[PDB]
Amino acid sequence: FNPADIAETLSELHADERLLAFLKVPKEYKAEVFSHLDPDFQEETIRSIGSDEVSEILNAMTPDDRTALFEDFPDELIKYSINHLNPQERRIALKLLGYDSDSIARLMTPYYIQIRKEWTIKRCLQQIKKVGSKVETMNYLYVVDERNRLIDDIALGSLLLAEEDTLVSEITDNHFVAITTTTSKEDAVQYFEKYDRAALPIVTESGVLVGIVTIDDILDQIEQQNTE
Amino acid sequence: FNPADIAETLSELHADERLLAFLKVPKEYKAEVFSHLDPDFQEETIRSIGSDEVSEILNAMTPDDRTALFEDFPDELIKYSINHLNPQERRIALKLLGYDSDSIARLMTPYYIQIRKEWTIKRCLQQIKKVGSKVETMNYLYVVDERNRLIDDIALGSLLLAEEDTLVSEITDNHFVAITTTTSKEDAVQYFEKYDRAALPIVTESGVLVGIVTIDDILDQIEQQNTE
Ligand SMILES: [Mg+2]
Ligand SMILES: [Mg+2]
Ligand SMILES: [Mg+2]
Ligand SMILES: [Mg+2]
Ligand SMILES: [Mg+2]
Ligand SMILES: [Mg+2]
Ligand SMILES: [Mg+2]
Ligand SMILES: [Mg+2]
Ligand SMILES: [Mg+2]
Ligand SMILES: [Mg+2]
Secondary structure, eight states, X not given: OOHHHHHHHHHHSOHHHHHHHHHTSOTTTHHHHHTTSOHHHHHHHHHHSOHHHHHHHHHHSOHHHHHHHHHTSOHHHHHHHHHTSOHHHHHHHHHHHHSOTXXXXXXXXXXXXXXXXXXXXXXXXXXXXXXXXXXXXXXXXXXXXXXXXXXXXXXXXXXHHSOTTSBGGGTOOSOOOOEETTSBHHHHHHHHXXXXXXXXXXXXXXXXEEEEEEHHHHHHHHHHHHHO | OOHHHHHHHHHHSOHHHHHHHHHTSOTTTHHHHHTTSOHXXXXXXXXXXXHHHHHHHHHHSOHHHHHHHHHTSOHHHHHHHHHTSOHHHHXXXXXXXXXXXXXXXXXXXXXXXXXXXXSBHHHHHHHHHHHTTTSSOSSEEEEEOTTSBEEEEEEHHHHHXXXXXXXXXXXXXXXXXXXXXXXXXXXXXXXXXXHOOSEEEEEOTTOBEEEEEEHHXXXXXXXXXXXX
């Protein structure tokens, strides 16, 4: 079944049997199912399960789902959870939590596809095969220079419409939409509304690409604002 | 400049000079710029410009932007506008307007990519090149049988991760999310929120694929509901 559907069925159970049924979920989509559950039950689960299981779930969550989870935790549980993260996930999680709580960066993930201006389209397709299964989305490719700075945002389909011998520099327009880490979540919503893109890149004040935010999470932000 | 940015600059002008500046827009993205302008000015423009210009703009708009425009028009202007549409666009526009005004189908577009279970991945890529520039999005591929019925929704990146000799039938799971034309716009929003997909397909009660709805238009629906 679809992870969102599995999560809905679990959410209908009383909490006590909900934990047993969740632990029956196969491990490949256990983290994805977990990401759809209520924050109070997510906290109960993190407090209750064994350390190895905590690490499996937390290390497999997306960085932005993990940040959203940690925002609702007491500080002590945040530290416990971070102590269960592997080195790379731990560094990512602490970087994201370092941003101001109102910043758009709190919603971002660093798992995006990076391409280079000197690459052929064929080389881009090879990179896409390399990282495609681990990234948040394959549908946007971020052209970055040697200084980590964002220079273009190329749609996946545009790459497919070009010939494989073409260089990325021949299909770039050097125009793109990006949101800075200074921008609040509320203000970032209007970028998404205006530009009608399913992901937007998040850059530092000097133009360095640090993550992407996706439209599904923006919809949650809109509903949170409108209830609050 | 970006069409949304051009539209914003135009929207800042007083209406009188706004029409002249808009008619200066190059024709390739004139319709896209038009789609971002206020409905009252869109109506003034349709009433004012020549028949050839009316046809160029209206025939180049997306079917769902056109339906949204027509929903705010007096009936007489709807008829005038439809009389300016080319045969294919006219049949599409009348089909969309035939649905109940509260139906999710009012938000849909028929410009999606259709693939077949018997095709190789290579053949799918050839189809994607064929239609890619005209469709609403290249990022979702709709597997349909000989009876026009929807059987799967394949992400573009998934197609890229497979080898070109593989048949579509070897990468389908026969599980998908679809919304029926019976469903209201309000109820359709929750499908988008739950399943976190940037497009969803719209099917008839017998399972025939008739269009797709995209998340950017759903965001507009959420804001319209929340103001209303
Ligand atoms: Mg996310
Ligand atoms: Mg997610
Ligand atoms: Mg969330
Ligand atoms: Mg660009
Ligand atoms: Mg919009
Ligand atoms: Mg649309
Ligand atoms: Mg549009
Ligand atoms: Mg609209
Ligand atoms: Mg499927
Ligand atoms: Mg959601």
